[PDB]
Amino acid sequence: MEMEKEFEQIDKSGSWAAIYQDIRHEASDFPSRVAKLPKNKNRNRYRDVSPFDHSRIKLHQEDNDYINASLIKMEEAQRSYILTQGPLPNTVGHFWEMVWEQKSRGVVMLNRVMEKGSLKCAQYWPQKEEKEMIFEDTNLKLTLISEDIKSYYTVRQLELENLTTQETREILHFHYTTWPDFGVPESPASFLNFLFKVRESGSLSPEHGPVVVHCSAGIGRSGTFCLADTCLLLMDKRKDPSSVDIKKVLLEMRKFRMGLIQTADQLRFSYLAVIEGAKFIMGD
Ligand SMILES: Oc1noc2ccccc12
């Protein structure tokens, strides 16, 4: 069923809450035993958001290999993403270690450091060229190279140096700065424009490690980003662009990380983004 018609049907009936609860009911449930070990309590921002053991990213150290991050691998679409929480004061070094070890080219950030008057994640990147950051626990150095501030997003060029080997890489920071404190954007135009900027960079392409994507918990706004990307990619690959069932794509993604899409408004916004984005993907 063409999703644009499914969309108008759900909207006229006002059954977004009912669709959403059906997804919650059918979603996968797998063990998260490593996340719940007492030694990892200060490595988790939220007590009810944990990576599944089967799909968690492991840090390459013998000490403690744990980070709140999951590898989402979409077989048909041929895309991988790592979804993670906003770094904590004691996990900033783990975060950049993961970026290094997984060979990521891009970091996508969908929240502000402060929202609703509270801290949603650590200030984990340098704000001035001449004031670089050093992560002593993981032996990395991070330098701001350049900054391009636009109305809806900011792109930063960063240099990440493995102090152990003195290799350096360029990381692109894509920061979406205008998601509202409550609800979802009224139009997806600016979100879609942001997605196409990340795509244009090469950060989502198979010659790099997976893109690292985060918000505060790494399930809501982060979920919306990778669901929309994957759905538009499938609508270009397959011979019938109307085979693409957004609910089935979401349940496939929820086999890799719990809670992707946090509200019935985020589910509706995801539909709107895919429907509006398709009017480029089909030749315009
Ligand atoms: O309709 C379709 N064309 O190509 C496909 C591949 C997978 C699933 C559905 C379809």
Short mmCIF file of N, CA and C and ligand atoms in Angstrom, two decimals, residues 76 234 237-244, ligand 1:
data_model
loop_
_atom_site.label_atom_id
_atom_site.label_comp_id
_atom_site.label_asym_id
_atom_site.label_seq_id
_atom_site.Cartn_x
_atom_site.Cartn_y
_atom_site.Cartn_z
N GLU A 76 19.76 -5.52 2.87
CA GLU A 76 19.32 -5.17 1.48
C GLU A 76 19.79 -3.76 1.12
N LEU A 234 16.05 2.31 -0.22
CA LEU A 234 15.32 1.10 -0.72
C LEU A 234 14.40 1.48 -1.90
N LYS A 237 16.56 1.40 -5.12
CA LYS A 237 17.17 0.09 -5.46
C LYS A 237 16.10 -0.80 -6.10
N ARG A 238 14.91 -0.88 -5.51
CA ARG A 238 13.90 -1.91 -5.84
C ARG A 238 13.06 -1.46 -7.05
N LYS A 239 12.53 -2.43 -7.79
CA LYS A 239 11.82 -2.18 -9.08
C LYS A 239 10.44 -1.57 -8.78
N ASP A 240 9.82 -1.95 -7.65
CA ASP A 240 8.56 -1.31 -7.19
C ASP A 240 8.84 -0.46 -5.96
N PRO A 241 9.05 0.87 -6.13
CA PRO A 241 9.26 1.78 -5.00
C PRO A 241 8.14 1.79 -3.95
N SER A 242 7.01 1.13 -4.24
CA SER A 242 5.83 1.07 -3.33
C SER A 242 5.82 -0.23 -2.51
N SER A 243 6.84 -1.08 -2.65
CA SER A 243 7.05 -2.28 -1.79
C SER A 243 7.53 -1.83 -0.40
N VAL A 244 8.08 -0.62 -0.28
CA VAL A 244 8.83 -0.18 0.93
C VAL A 244 7.82 0.13 2.04
O1 LIG B 1 8.73 -4.68 -5.01
C1 LIG B 1 10.03 -4.97 -5.04
N1 LIG B 1 10.89 -4.80 -6.07
O2 LIG B 1 12.12 -5.23 -5.68
C2 LIG B 1 12.04 -5.69 -4.37
C3 LIG B 1 13.08 -6.20 -3.58
C4 LIG B 1 12.72 -6.58 -2.28
C5 LIG B 1 11.40 -6.45 -1.79
C6 LIG B 1 10.38 -5.93 -2.59
C7 LIG B 1 10.73 -5.54 -3.89
#
